[PDB]
Symmetry: C2
Subunit: 80 residues, 2 copies
């Protein structure tokens, strides 16, 4: 019924695919633990701009991993 | 609208609170980065039994981090 996408991007360009998911109202788990760190930063910044624009959110869920949500997904709880 | 719960348990007994969320049709992200490693294992095994019982799923989504879902959440892609 609801859909969550798991994403492990290799290059900065793959952020566009993630943003398309968000625009289509799906949450996306973004694992950046195994990407070049300079590229990870770029992804996160791009996705911050995406979510800012569509009224969603982006939240760190662990070391170099994030949950991006559209406005139709409420997230509760926190991770240190 | 849907709800996703973020959990960072510190003791094994908190796996019950995660299981309650799943029985109530919410996905839970379970970050086991801060718990003792021996106890992480035991949480992950407890949750596999829970999801087995209710027809959901458990998927590793990074180091020491898992996505548990009930049957009403479809997960696509992999990590």
């Amino acid at each position: 019924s609801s859909k969550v996408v798991l994403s492990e991007p290799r290059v900065y360009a793959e952020a566009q695919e993630i943003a398309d998911h968000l625009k289509n109202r799906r949450a996306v788990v973004v694992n950046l633990q195994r990407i070049q760190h300079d590229q990870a930063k770029r992804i996160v910044d791009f996705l911050s701009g995406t979510v800012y624009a569509i009224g969603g959110d982006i939240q760190r869920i662990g070391s170099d991993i994030f949950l991006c949500t559209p406005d139709n997904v409420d997230v509760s709880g926190t991770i240190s």
